[PDB]
Amino acid sequence: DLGKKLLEAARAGQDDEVRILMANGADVNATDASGLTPLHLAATYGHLEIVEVLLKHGADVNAIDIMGSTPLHLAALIGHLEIVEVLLKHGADVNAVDTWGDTPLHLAAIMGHLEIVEVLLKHGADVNAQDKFGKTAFDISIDNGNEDLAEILQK
Amino acid sequence: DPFELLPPSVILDKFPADFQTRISSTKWKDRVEALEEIHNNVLKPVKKLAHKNQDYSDYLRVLANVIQKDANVQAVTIAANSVQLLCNSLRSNFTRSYGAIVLVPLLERTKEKKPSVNEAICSALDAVATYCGFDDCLEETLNYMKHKTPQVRIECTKFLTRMLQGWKSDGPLQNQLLFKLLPEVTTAVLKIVNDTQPTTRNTGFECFATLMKLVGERELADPLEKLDNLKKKKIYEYYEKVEV
Amino acid sequence: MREIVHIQAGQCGNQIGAKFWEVISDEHGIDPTGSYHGDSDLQLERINVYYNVPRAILVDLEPGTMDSVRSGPFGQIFRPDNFVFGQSGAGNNWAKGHYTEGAELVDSVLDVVRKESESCDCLQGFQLTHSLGGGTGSGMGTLLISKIREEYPDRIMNTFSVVPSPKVSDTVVEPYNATLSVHQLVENTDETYCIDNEALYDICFRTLKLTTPTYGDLNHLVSATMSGVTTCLRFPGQLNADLRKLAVNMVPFPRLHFFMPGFAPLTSRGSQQYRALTVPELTQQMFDAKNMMAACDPRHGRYLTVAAVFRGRMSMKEVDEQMLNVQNKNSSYFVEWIPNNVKTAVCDIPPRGLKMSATFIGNSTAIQELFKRISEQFTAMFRRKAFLHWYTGEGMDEMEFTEAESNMNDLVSEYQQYQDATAD
Numbered sequence: 092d093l094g095k096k097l098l099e100a101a102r103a104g105q106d107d108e109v110r111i112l113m114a115n116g117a118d119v120n121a122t123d124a125s126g127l128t129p130l131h132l133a134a135t136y137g138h139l140e141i142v143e144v145l146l147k148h149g150a151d152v153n154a155i156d157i158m159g160s161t162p163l164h165l166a167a168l169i170g171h172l173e174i175v176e177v178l179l180k181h182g183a184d185v186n187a188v189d190t191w192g193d194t195p196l197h198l199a200a201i202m203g204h205l206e207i208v209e210v211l212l213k214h215g216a217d218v219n220a221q222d223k224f225g226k227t228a229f230d231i232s233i234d235n236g237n238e239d240l241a242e243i244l245q246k
Numbered sequence: 247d248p249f250e251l252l253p254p255s256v257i258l259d260k261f262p263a264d265f266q267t268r269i270s271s272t273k274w275k276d277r278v279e280a281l282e283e284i285h286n287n288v289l290k291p292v293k294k295l296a297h298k299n300q301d302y303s304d305y306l307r308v309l310a311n312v313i314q315k316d317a318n319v320q321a322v323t324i325a326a327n328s329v330q331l332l333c334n335s336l337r338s339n340f341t342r343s344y345g346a347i348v349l350v351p352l353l354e355r356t357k358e359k360k361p362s363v364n365e366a367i368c369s370a371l372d373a374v375a376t377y378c379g380f381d382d383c384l385e386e387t388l389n390y391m392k393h394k395t396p397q398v399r400i401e402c403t404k405f406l407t408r409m410l411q412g413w414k415s416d417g418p419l420q421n422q423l424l425f426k427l428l429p430e431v432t433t434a435v436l437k438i439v440n441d442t443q444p445t446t447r448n449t450g451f452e453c454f455a456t457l458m459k460l461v462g463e464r465e466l467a468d469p470l471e472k473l474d475n476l477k478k479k480k481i482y483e484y485y486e487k488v489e490v
Numbered sequence: 491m492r493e494i495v496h497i498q499a500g501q502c503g504n505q506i507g508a509k510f511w512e513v514i515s516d517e518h519g520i521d522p523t524g525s526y527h528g529d530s531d532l533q534l535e536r537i538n539v540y541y542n543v544p545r546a547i548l549v550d551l552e553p554g555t556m557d558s559v560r561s562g563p564f565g566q567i568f569r570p571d572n573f574v575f576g577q578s579g580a581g582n583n584w585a586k587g588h589y590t591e592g593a594e595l596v597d598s599v600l601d602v603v604r605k606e607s608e609s610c611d612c613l614q615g616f617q618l619t620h621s622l623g624g625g626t627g628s629g630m631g632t633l634l635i636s637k638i639r640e641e642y643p644d645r646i647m648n649t650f651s652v653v654p655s656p657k658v659s660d661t662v663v664e665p666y667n668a669t670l671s672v673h674q675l676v677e678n679t680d681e682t683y684c685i686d687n688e689a690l691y692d693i694c695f696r697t698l699k700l701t702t703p704t705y706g707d708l709n710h711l712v713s714a715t716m717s718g719v720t721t722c723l724r725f726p727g728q729l730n731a732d733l734r735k736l737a738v739n740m741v742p743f744p745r746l747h748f749f750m751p752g753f754a755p756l757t758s759r760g761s762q763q764y765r766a767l768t769v770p771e772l773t774q775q776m777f778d779a780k781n782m783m784a785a786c787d788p789r790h791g792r793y794l795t796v797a798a799v800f801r802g803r804m805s806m807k808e809v810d811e812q813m814l815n816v817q818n819k820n821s822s823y824f825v826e827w828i829p830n831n832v833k834t835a836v837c838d839i840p841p842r843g844l845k846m847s848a849t850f851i852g853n854s855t856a857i858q859e860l861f862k863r864i865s866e867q868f869t870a871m872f873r874r875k876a877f878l879h880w881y882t883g884e885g886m887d888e889m890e891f892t893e894a895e896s897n898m899n900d901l902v903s904e905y906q907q908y909q910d911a912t913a914d
């Protein structure tokens with residue numbers, strides 16, 4: 092399966108061998124087992140050139156997986172500021188929700204990616220968005236002792 | 247009828263050429279894959295090994311080498327599961343050479359506290375016990391109850407408890423248990439009963455109430471008196487809750 | 491109960507470790523060559539505790555750290571044999587430190603531990619400094635602990651573990667490493683001082699007004715805290731004298747042995763403290779959450795036990811009064827069912843630079859806030875299963891993460907139980 096080799100590459104980060112596999116017509120939106128496209132995997136492990144290659148060949152920027160995770164979720168979780176702005180520029184879902192009720196703003200706030208938090212907010216993030224337990228991004232800064240984040244959330 | 251009468255399987259021809267060097271490698275994953283292969287591909291499928299004219303005492307002495315000394319706890323876990331498989335699918339083989347080649351290594355490695363690893367090491371010790379009943383285990387299990395590591399004490403004593411629940415009464419009452427009962431078994435179980443740690447002591451309390459159940463709460467009433475009245479009622483607690 | 495063997499593992503381990511040896515070598519009057527140039531007997535009274543030359547073992551998988559220590563100021567003093575270093579590094583992989591690469595080296599380390607313990611009149615216990623978000627300090631350290639725990643079960647295990655925070659390193663696997671390591675410490679150590687990088691940054695940034703704190707800036711706060719809590723151990727004194735007596739009077743339940751340290755006054759790197767504080771001022775740096783080395787609010791929980799160490803010449807009468815005061819004027823914050831749970835001790839020799847100082851070791855249930863933060867970060871990471879192939883590749887099982895997750899949450903619930911408990 093050529094859609095499975097393109098996931099192997101986009102994950103481990105062999106920039107050159109993506110172009111090889113894609114020139115062989117590999118499925119840009121090929122799902123693995125839990126529904127993760129190559130754009131998901133590259134946006135998780137920080138391979139910026141592989142993200143922009145897949146997006147311009149037609150990668151579902153707002154593709155979800157078995158747990159409702161968009162690539163912007165995973166980029167905002169791990170903290171890849173370079174990739175976050177690339178996805179948003181390609182029409183990413185700034186207020187996407189996943190199976191646990193989190194938005195990308197929730198994940199960037201939990202992991203302390205203050206520089207990414209400000210990017211999401213300026214792209215119209217839902218500051219008052221709630222999760223399953225009922226907590227906003229502002230509640231996380233209150234609960235987690237981060238006053239640098241509380242100030243960045245009320246800006 | 248013994249269901250073991252089904253035709254037996256042979257595994258010596260299954261081994262690969264690159265194996266002795268892989269298991270005797272410095273890279274952990276070489277050793278792991280080597281062991282993990284012959285276990286999932288070669289041992290796990292079969293259901294009866296070849297009794298006739300098969301020398302496994304070259305293979306088993308390298309499972310011991312890793313179970314004892316190998317620094318990778320993962321390589322330990324997958325090896326003791328191999329050892330169990332051999333002792334399980336080839337019943338009535340581990341007479342002495344086989345049984346004794348892996349016994350004292352296994353008892354040393356109960357020191358491991360990771361649940362998955364203690365699971366595998368103990369379960370293999372149960373395998374050799376069910377087919378090498380009190381051959382060398384009674385003599386060597388006691389030895390490692392006297393050992394300095396706290397974890398090996400509670401586990402090798404739990405081991406004697408496991409073995410004792412499945413004890414055999416063939417012959418008169420001059421089995422290996424009675425030849426060494428008061429001299430060795432009891433003198434060693436009291437060392438556990440009187441340990442500094444509670445969780446250690448609490449294993450001895452079962453391992454003494456499972457002892458009384460086998461050999462009469464009257465015979466051992468002599469060391470019962472020398473014991474605290476406070477520890478006595480804990481020992482009796484298990485005596486009421488332990489079966490045979 | 492005399493000698494203490496010291497260990498430092500990982501980059502952070504050797505950093506705050508060497509800083510600690512810098513501080514207390516001065517306080518004891520030892521030069522980098524290893525010769526006494528002091529002028530007091532209270533200095534060499536209990537020098538046999540940490541010295542023989544330090545009773546210190548240096549460990550790291552990263553071999554470069556070797557030279558970062560010896561090329562330091564007091565780097566010449568450590569015994570050459572007690573350097574035990576690997577070829578490659580762990581690279582923020584707890585599994586590499588605990589199961590694969592760190593395990594291959596751990597034997598060489600235990601050989602040196604044995605050697606130093608062999609020549610001890612009467613060992614007290616051990617002392618480990620390390621970081622929890624790393625791969626070596628956390629993975630090999632916690633593995634070293636258990637290996638010592640089973641080789642020396644009649645001895646105390648006391649750790650100075652520093653907690654990762656996004657404010658100091660943006661590495662997202664640190665919640666994994668720290669959570670797995672807490673699962674070890676709750677089962678393997680008698681007492682652990684919780685150094686939170688979150689709180690060290692918030693102190694250097696907000697209280698000391700340093701716009702960008704460096705490691706050296708945070709390490710200054712740590713090394714001073716260590717000498718403060720170890721003041722009882724290193725000088726003559728009645729109360730909290732040895733490691734076991736301390737833990738006996740600090741830890742009422744075996745799993746709940748995570749201390750929230752904090753001390754006063756907070757100074758910068760070599761700044762000038764014009765007017766030495768008064769006794770009531772020092773005392774009022776206890777509840778002051780801006781002095782806690784762990785990012786927790788004591789107001790949000792209850793103190794189980796408290797140990798106070800006042801350093802310097804001052805009124806023992808006034809200290810007793812101020813401590814007895816602050817307890818009963820905030821009686822709802824100290825647990826009622828443990829009477830005389832706060833204990834104070836004084837040492838006449840102050841720390842260098844300061845005329846007076848005060849260290850505040852506290853077992854506060856508020857520490858559950860700290861474990862909440864790590865758990866939420868861990869779970870957010872773990873529910874999306876990020877970077878799991880690192881750990882599983884090194885022989886770990888996915889189940890292990892679930893157990894560590896649940897075991898830390900049980901630890902949080904336990905703290906919450908005793909917080910809501912009543913004497914009635």
Ligand SMILES: Nc1nc2c(ncn2[C@@H]2O[C@H](COP(=O)(O)OP(=O)(O)O)[C@@H](O)[C@H]2O)c(=O)[nH]1
Nearest residue numbers: 500501502505621623624625626627654658705
């Ligand atoms: N306070 C302090 N924390 C550190 C220092 N170095 C690293 N850390 C923290 O420790 C974690 C990194 O682990 P580290 O010790 O460098 O990895 P190791 O070499 O494999 O043990 C991160 O959370 C860092 O914030 C230091 O010098 N001081």
Ligand SMILES: [Mg+2]
Nearest residue numbers: 501552579626
């Ligand atoms: Mg390192």
